[PDB]
Amino acid sequence: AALRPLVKPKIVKKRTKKFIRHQSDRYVKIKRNWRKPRGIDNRVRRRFKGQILMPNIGYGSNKKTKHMLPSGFRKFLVHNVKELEVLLMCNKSYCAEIAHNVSSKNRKAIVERAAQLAIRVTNPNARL
Amino acid sequence: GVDIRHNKDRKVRRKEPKSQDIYLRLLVKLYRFLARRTNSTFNQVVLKRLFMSRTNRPPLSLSRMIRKMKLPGRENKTAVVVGTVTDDVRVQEVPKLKVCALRVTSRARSRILKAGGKILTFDQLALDSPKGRGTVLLSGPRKGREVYRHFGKAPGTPHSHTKPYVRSKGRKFERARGRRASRGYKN
Amino acid sequence: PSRLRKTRKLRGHVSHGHGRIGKHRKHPGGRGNAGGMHHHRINFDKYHPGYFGKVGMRHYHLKRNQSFCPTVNLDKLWTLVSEQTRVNAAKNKTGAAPIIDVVRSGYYKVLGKGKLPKQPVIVKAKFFSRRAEEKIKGVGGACVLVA
Amino acid sequence: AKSKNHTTHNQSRKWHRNGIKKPRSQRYESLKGVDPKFLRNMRFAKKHNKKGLKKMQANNAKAMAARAEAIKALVVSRKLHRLAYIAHPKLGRRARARIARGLR
Amino acid sequence: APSRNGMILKPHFHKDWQRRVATWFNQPARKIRRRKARQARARRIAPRPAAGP
Amino acid sequence: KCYHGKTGRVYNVTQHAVGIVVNKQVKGKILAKRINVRIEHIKHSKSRDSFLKRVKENDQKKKEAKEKGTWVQLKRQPAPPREAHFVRTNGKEPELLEPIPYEFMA
RNA sequence: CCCAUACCCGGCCGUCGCUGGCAGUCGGCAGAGCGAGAAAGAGAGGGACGCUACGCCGCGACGAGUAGGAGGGCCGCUGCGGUGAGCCUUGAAGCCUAGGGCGCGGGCCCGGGUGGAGCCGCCGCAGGUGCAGAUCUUGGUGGUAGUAGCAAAU
RNA sequence: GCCGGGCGUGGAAUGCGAGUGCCUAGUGGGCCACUUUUGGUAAGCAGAACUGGCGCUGCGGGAUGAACCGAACGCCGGGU
């Protein structure tokens, strides 16, 4: 009963786990965000066996399915009802996403307008 | 494992002008079309010369193109120069000219047009001659800048007539030891 | 624009673009133009020949206004007068030659650097060269001196 | 605290990176260092080369026409060879019109 | 520590110059002070000319 | 001593000497430097005339055989593999060879 | 017979090259081609998509990397000029999160909770702009540890 | 040394687009091996030549290992 996309291709990802910073587990000051090790003796840097993996461009997702949700759509942030009339001609490709700070009285104007324009919403059941 | 060197496989050349001039960027849109759908190699040279930096398209003097158009098998063809045509005050008579340049100085317009000449722009050149038929593509003196007199072999070298960088010239600025045979040595 | 400078791309890299072995110390070679006759000897011979020593006579109280003599070539000689003057002479049939007052334009000495259009002039200058006098005479003009 | 004194180890490798370029050959190499007395004469022979201008134009021209009289006094098998003639665009048109009637 | 081919420079900064740097933010306000007393000068001697003798 | 063996070309001839333009390799670059040498340390190099001889026949065989209408080879081709041929072994039989035993010669 | 990140085959990413291709979306003022081994002429007497040309598309080949160099950041931080008839007490910033996701990555967008008043996107401009280290500075808190210890002078 | 005119079967094989100019960082402690080699009884010692390595480099093998043998690396599936 959903608003199915144009075509639903088999998404295939080269890697699904995140990349963790080196020694980000052993410390709390070392946050999880990736930082390339530049040390002169660093194992991770010189690609030793059985270490953390360094992100290359070889892990790049297919351009046919890049920035594509599991539902076969692509997100687009929306702030008001006027920023929806843009997406009325990309119905089968680009879904709509209401921004966070949009109040609850304005969200129940966007969603049914997006039901009129047949645009899919990824966060319809909001604060409500 | 392939035994090659990737040292110089990325060819260093301009593929679009660094300038953000939209009138210049509109001309390139016009000549990108003419370069690839006409077999005329004239448009490929003009396309390559539109990309270049100002130091690579030096100004053409007015007397230089007079000197190059009074050559025999000419005087019906059109003058095409990608740089700019400055007026030369040291020439008196001006023949009638058919000029196409990117920019013409205000005095060089009034002196050309008073001689019954004709000044064209590159959009009008393509309309009058798409394949570049009957034109003479010219260029100003490229190594005429003051900078090249410092280049070459270094000064203080045997037979290396190269201008050094001095803060001021005078009798006591680089006239001593390296230059006089009386002071040590000279080259 | 600090956002275009290089240091934005050096954040994270340890030595900040100055090498680990040869660190960025205060002054490795000395301050200023030091070591001219010494450890920087090759740089001063290869790029500033003649830097060291004295030549010539020490003139004490040099007053630049005395040695003031801005030259003008014969190529751009007619540019000192209007185009109306240049045409009204080749059109004139009495042989009336215009006078070009060089000193009025700002120059003092006349040097002959090129060709002249063949119509006489009487250049009211202060100094002349030999070749400059030849060109004006050979065209059919005159060289009058003034102080 | 002694150290190494001299070694030509990495050098041969370093030279062949940008190649060992042979010196740039060019016709008309410079006439520098040639002995003056011979050169001083050579500049005189070039100074007086206009002297024979009329002779030279009136020597090769009468030699230009003298060349125009020596000319004026004169002026794997046939099977694959055949199939190579039908298979030619610019000069096999008349040939393969015989096959076009073979269907007719 | 000179590099390759450059120019031999002698900056005159070996003294302690950062104590006597005369900046010019007076300049826009200075002109107004000049002009507003140049008009008030002419107002005083109203029939006499503005440039003076 | 760095030119003893090196070959160059003459560009200036004096009474008892010649000027030569010879190549000298100096640390990864070649320099075409001019040296003045007396005649006594000089020979006409024959590393060239055998090509000058080859130019004669190449100019000879191009003018000749042109009126014959034929096309004859001019370029030097390297030594090819030899062609298939026979070997007559008339009457006699190839002698059998045998490795000799060891005789300690000292 | 076993297996390397080597070689072959196939996919995908990126870089490089072809200084590759595309303005021809030329429609009842129409007639749908320029893959063709061969220097040159389909010469005149009612119809999907596209082409932010700084866009799109097709082929090949290639991919290690400290010091160092450059390019791109729709990576991030703070302020300014513009702009979004932008968001906000029907809940902004900040913070928490076993929630749902995207990006190779820097990072980001949603859900929920808390909070109570301001904040952000885009095009430009500006910098005191991104931390793991410096026996770093200041603040705070652990392990040691309920341990040593609380024994000079009846 | 000048002109002028005439001769292309491009005159060995193989491979590959070249030329050229600016501006320029880092570096200027190196170390190991086959072969050659000087001093030393010798040394994981000191000093050179040539080439390749290590440094700057993971991977398979030598149990282990800066350098040995194989082979150099985008992310994956199959085969070898």
Side-chain angles (χ1 to χ4, degrees):
Chain A
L3 304 88
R4 291 184 184 188
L6 203 56
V7 293
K8 188 84 158 294
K10 193 281 166 187
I11 322 288
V12 48
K13 301 188 176 310
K14 295 173 177 182
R15 184 187 171 88
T16 74
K17 299 189 181 180
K18 297 284 287 276
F19 291 87
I20 55 156
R21 201 183 189 284
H22 187 207
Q23 299 185 330
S24 82
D25 49 338
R26 299 188 64 193
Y27 296 92
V28 187
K29 60 183 185 172
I30 301 302
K31 293 198 302 296
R32 185 261 315 276
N33 318 332
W34 167 254
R35 295 301 150 94
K36 167 175 281 308
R38 298 173 204 279
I40 61 180
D41 297 346
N42 183 274
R43 292 144 71 194
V44 173
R45 206 261 299 165
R46 51 184 179 171
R47 276 81 163 272
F48 265 93
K49 190 167 60 174
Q51 300 309 304
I52 320 183
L53 275 305
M54 281 202 313
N56 307 323
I57 201 63
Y59 291 97
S61 301
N62 184 13
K63 295 196 305 302
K64 291 198 34 164
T65 81
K66 196 167 188 178
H67 285 301
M68 175 153 305
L69 302 188
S71 158
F73 278 87
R74 297 194 164 82
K75 277 212 279 301
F76 180 74
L77 211 67
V78 169
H79 283 89
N80 46 67
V81 308
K82 193 187 174 298
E83 294 190 344
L84 270 172
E85 276 81 22
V86 168
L87 264 44
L88 71 93
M89 288 293 297
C90 291
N91 281 36
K92 303 292 200 66
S93 186
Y94 295 122
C95 57
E97 187 194 13
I98 315 174
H100 178 72
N101 42 6
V102 186
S103 69
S104 313
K105 67 183 297 184
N106 281 13
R107 283 166 173 272
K108 64 181 173 262
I110 286 185
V111 291
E112 73 271 21
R113 179 56 168 197
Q116 291 176 38
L117 291 164
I119 314 186
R120 186 208 188 82
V121 186
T122 50
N123 50 6
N125 41 11
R127 329 195 191 201
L128 283 167
Chain B
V2 192
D3 181 32
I4 53 171
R5 288 184 63 190
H6 314 84
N7 193 1
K8 44 181 68 177
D9 57 6
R10 183 201 92 188
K11 285 181 180 183
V12 175
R13 48 162 176 250
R14 295 222 163 185
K15 306 172 196 306
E16 51 96 12
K18 199 152 308 302
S19 158
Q20 296 294 110
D21 210 338
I22 62 175
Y23 289 96
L24 181 57
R25 275 195 165 273
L26 269 185
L27 280 183
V28 179
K29 282 187 180 177
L30 200 145
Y31 274 95
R32 277 186 183 280
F33 186 66
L34 287 185
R36 85 172 143 87
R37 281 191 65 189
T38 79
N39 75 291
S40 161
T41 49
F42 169 82
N43 293 336
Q44 313 193 356
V45 181
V46 184
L47 177 66
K48 180 157 41 154
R49 283 194 185 188
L50 274 176
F51 296 152
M52 297 183 192
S53 87
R54 173 175 286 177
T55 81
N56 275 120
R57 29 169 173 86
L60 177 68
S61 91
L62 183 49
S63 89
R64 192 166 207 99
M65 60 181 294
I66 291 304
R67 171 174 256 183
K68 289 309 180 307
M69 288 298 169
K70 66 153 53 180
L71 261 51
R74 291 174 189 179
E75 291 146 320
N76 51 7
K77 312 176 164 171
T78 288
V80 172
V81 48
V82 178
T84 171
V85 180
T86 74
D87 160 79
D88 205 7
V89 307
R90 48 168 176 250
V91 66
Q92 297 314 328
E93 68 178 2
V94 176
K96 54 176 305 161
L97 292 187
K98 303 189 290 224
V99 178
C100 167
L102 258 184
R103 193 179 65 85
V104 189
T105 77
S106 190
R107 200 186 319 193
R109 304 182 92 87
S110 43
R111 200 204 277 239
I112 280 178
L113 285 182
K114 194 51 53 195
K118 186 180 305 162
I119 304 176
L120 284 183
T121 74
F122 278 100
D123 50 345
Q124 299 159 280
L125 166 72
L127 289 177
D128 302 358
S129 161
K131 275 191 164 177
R133 287 226 296 252
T135 77
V136 188
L137 181 56
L138 293 195
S139 41
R142 188 182 300 270
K143 291 194 174 186
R145 296 196 291 138
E146 200 265 355
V147 172
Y148 297 96
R149 302 183 201 171
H150 303 277
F151 289 172
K153 292 166 62 175
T157 308
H159 284 292
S160 177
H161 315 84
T162 306
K163 179 189 285 282
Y165 292 110
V166 292
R167 56 177 204 236
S168 313
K169 78 183 307 183
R171 72 155 178 84
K172 59 181 182 182
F173 303 110
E174 271 70 2
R175 309 280 179 184
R177 191 172 95 95
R179 289 284 163 77
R180 296 281 185 268
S182 89
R183 272 96 177 99
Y185 71 103
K186 73 179 291 185
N187 301 323
Chain C
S2 87
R3 69 200 188 278
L4 288 170
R5 279 185 170 87
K6 186 182 166 196
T7 184
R8 289 296 116 193
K9 303 308 200 73
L10 288 188
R11 287 278 175 250
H13 307 79
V14 188
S15 306
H16 196 286
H18 284 309
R20 320 177 97 96
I21 318 171
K23 305 108 171 178
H24 189 199
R25 292 282 159 75
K26 291 289 189 178
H27 289 99
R31 294 201 187 187
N33 308 318
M37 292 295 184
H38 297 310
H39 60 287
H40 294 155
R41 169 77 76 103
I42 309 190
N43 197 297
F44 281 82
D45 285 332
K46 209 196 174 191
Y47 297 123
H48 306 97
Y51 181 70
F52 290 121
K54 287 190 297 182
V55 285
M57 309 191 313
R58 303 167 307 155
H59 180 58
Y60 287 163
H61 180 59
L62 179 55
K63 298 175 295 295
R64 284 282 164 84
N65 299 344
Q66 288 183 359
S67 165
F68 178 77
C69 172
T71 54
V72 54
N73 290 310
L74 287 181
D75 274 325
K76 52 183 56 52
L77 182 69
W78 285 90
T79 78
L80 285 63
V81 295
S82 52
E83 183 70 286
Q84 175 165 302
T85 308
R86 189 248 184 265
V87 181
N88 268 343
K91 285 182 34 65
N92 175 83
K93 291 293 297 318
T94 42
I99 46 183
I100 289 186
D101 186 354
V102 176
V103 192
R104 174 187 176 177
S105 157
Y107 308 105
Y108 280 155
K109 194 149 184 174
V110 161
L111 316 177
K113 205 205 173 298
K115 213 190 272 283
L116 268 169
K118 301 173 183 177
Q119 46 184 336
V121 289
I122 311 95
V123 285
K124 265 184 181 285
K126 195 187 296 274
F127 292 117
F128 287 99
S129 177
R130 181 178 67 86
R131 286 93 172 167
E133 183 193 68
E134 305 214 339
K135 312 274 189 52
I136 302 172
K137 288 310 170 64
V139 165
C143 275
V144 291
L145 295 161
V146 72
Chain D
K2 290 207 292 195
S3 90
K4 200 153 192 163
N5 320 113
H6 155 88
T7 167
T8 308
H9 181 259
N10 205 26
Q11 304 316 292
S12 59
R13 179 178 296 169
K14 281 213 303 194
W15 297 331
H16 291 72
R17 293 238 176 88
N18 303 322
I20 299 192
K21 310 292 296 169
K22 312 202 51 195
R24 186 47 48 163
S25 171
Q26 178 62 73
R27 88 198 300 244
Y28 307 142
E29 62 99 10
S30 178
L31 267 60
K32 189 191 69 177
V34 190
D35 67 322
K37 186 183 63 181
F38 154 74
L39 186 87
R40 160 193 172 88
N41 167 79
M42 201 207 85
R43 301 188 44 189
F44 285 141
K46 285 174 155 185
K47 174 187 182 183
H48 306 297
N49 264 315
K50 288 180 70 177
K51 185 189 170 189
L53 196 74
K54 300 180 293 296
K55 289 182 186 171
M56 278 327 287
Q57 55 91 32
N59 223 333
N60 317 128
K62 74 99 177 176
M64 174 56 148
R67 180 212 33 76
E69 279 88 61
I71 299 194
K72 196 44 63 184
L74 321 172
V75 175
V76 301
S77 163
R78 72 180 73 265
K79 184 175 177 67
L80 271 72
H81 209 84
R82 177 66 184 206
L83 292 149
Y85 184 76
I86 314 191
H88 196 285
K90 199 177 51 154
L91 49 96
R93 292 137 59 173
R94 191 192 199 262
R96 52 206 160 216
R98 306 281 92 198
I99 293 91
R101 286 201 150 260
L103 65 92
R104 300 204 147 204
Chain E
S3 81
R4 319 167 182 84
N5 179 29
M7 197 177 78
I8 291 305
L9 268 188
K10 309 248 187 165
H12 289 64
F13 288 136
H14 305 81
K15 293 190 186 173
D16 185 78
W17 57 274
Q18 274 171 270
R19 287 196 222 141
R20 288 166 314 261
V21 179
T23 67
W24 280 62
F25 312 110
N26 302 109
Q27 189 194 65
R30 185 201 305 277
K31 289 170 163 298
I32 308 175
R33 179 186 316 146
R34 293 240 184 88
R35 188 154 66 90
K36 288 217 147 299
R38 194 182 302 118
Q39 302 174 297
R41 183 182 204 276
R43 291 171 147 214
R44 177 187 316 119
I45 47 184
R48 312 169 183 84
Chain F
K1 57 194 189 303
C2 60
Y3 311 112
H4 181 95
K6 307 285 171 293
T7 313
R9 39 160 282 262
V10 186
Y11 79 106
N12 176 64
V13 176
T14 73
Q15 281 84 20
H16 324 85
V18 291
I20 304 171
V21 175
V22 60
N23 297 289
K24 184 192 173 200
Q25 182 195 84
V26 52
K27 305 192 305 185
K29 58 189 188 306
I30 318 294
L31 287 184
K33 49 200 307 187
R34 328 198 151 189
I35 58 171
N36 300 275
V37 186
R38 273 181 172 258
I39 309 301
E40 298 87 300
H41 323 292
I42 283 306
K43 286 179 304 175
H44 262 293
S45 158
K46 295 187 304 307
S47 49
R48 170 86 167 172
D49 59 355
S50 310
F51 154 72
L52 298 172
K53 191 258 287 185
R54 192 155 44 82
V55 165
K56 295 304 172 188
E57 287 101 17
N58 278 166
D59 294 337
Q60 200 270 342
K61 292 187 308 304
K62 195 178 297 175
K63 175 55 187 200
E64 201 269 321
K66 184 161 174 123
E67 56 271 49
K68 308 196 58 54
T70 186
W71 159 77
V72 295
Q73 195 77 289
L74 296 187
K75 313 186 191 295
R76 286 164 303 156
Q77 284 294 93
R82 51 193 152 275
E83 300 88 300
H85 57 107
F86 278 79
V87 169
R88 289 180 66 256
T89 168
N90 54 331
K92 52 171 223 193
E93 208 274 320
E95 71 176 7
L96 181 46
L97 290 175
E98 275 185 0
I100 68 167
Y102 187 61
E103 295 289 328
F104 189 77
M105 271 307 317

